[PDB]
Amino acid sequence: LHKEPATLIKAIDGDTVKLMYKGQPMTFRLLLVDTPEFNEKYGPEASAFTKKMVENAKKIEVEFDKGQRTDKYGRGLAYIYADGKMVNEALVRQGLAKVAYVYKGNNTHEQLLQKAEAQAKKEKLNIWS
Ligand SMILES: Cc1cn([C@H]2C[C@H](OP(=O)(O)O)[C@@H](COP(=O)(O)O)O2)c(=O)[nH]c1=O
Ligand SMILES: [Ca+2]
């Protein structure tokens, strides 16, 4: 996989963010994770976590997997990195997202994220508390 540049337009929630990519505004949905909706428990905390990570970054990058790059709603599907740290993973490691939506051919970082989840769960963090 390859990292590509993007810039933040606006944080949205725990697992969606609006970025400018190749000069065009797009909503991205984070691969392989599910954060609670804002109205659900840990939703606000997930929103806040993602917002802080992307707003504080000097450099946002997008990394598409090998499969589908957009979902049926037109959202980009990618791993998102903030100053080199994967937001997807960081969410899972902090117990603010579950590994989820693992579809074959867009699952390159599945094992990485399952490992993060196992550690979050062992720590009894957030969703696992
Ligand atoms: C994360 C991801 C979501 N989706 C679609 C599946 C779900 O369809 P439904 O809307 O029919 O449930 C929805 C979940 O996104 P949200 O968790 O953002 O609601 O997005 C994909 O198609 N591919 C993906 O990789
Ligand atoms: Ca969600």
Domain spans in the chain, listed from the N-terminal domain onward: 1-129
Q: Is 40 in the pocket of ligand 1 (CB under 6 A)?
A: no
Angle at 116 between CA 59 and CA 37, to 5 degrees: 75
Tokens of 52: 């802080």
What is the bridge-based pairing of β-strands 24-30 and 76-82?
parallel
The strand ranges marked E within the chain are 4-11, 16-21, 24-30, 33-34, 60-63, 76-82, 85-86, 98-99
Atom of ligand 1 nearest to the CA of 33: 1
d(CA 97, CA 113): 10
CATH of domain 1-129: 2.40.50.90
Which residues participate in the annotated binding site?
Answer: 15, 34-35
Q: Which residue from 62, 64, 63, 59 is spatially nearest to 83, judged by alpha carbons? A: 59
Instruction: Please give the method by which this entry was determined.
Output: X-ray
d(CA 1, CA 77): 13
Q: What is the dihedral of CA 71, 5, 100, 46, to 10 degrees?
A: -110
The answer to whether 14 and 35 have CB atoms below 8 angstroms apart is: yes
**Three-class SS of residue 118?**
helix
Angle at 63 between CA 98 and CA 80, to 5 degrees: 50
User: Cβ of 63: how many Cβ atoms within 10 Å?
Assistant: 17
Ligand nearest to the CA of 101: 1
CA distances from 56 to 8, 26, 41, 60, 120 (A): 10, 19, 24, 10, 23
Q: Which residue from 40, 20, 58, 21 is spatially nearest to 96, judged by alpha carbons? A: 40
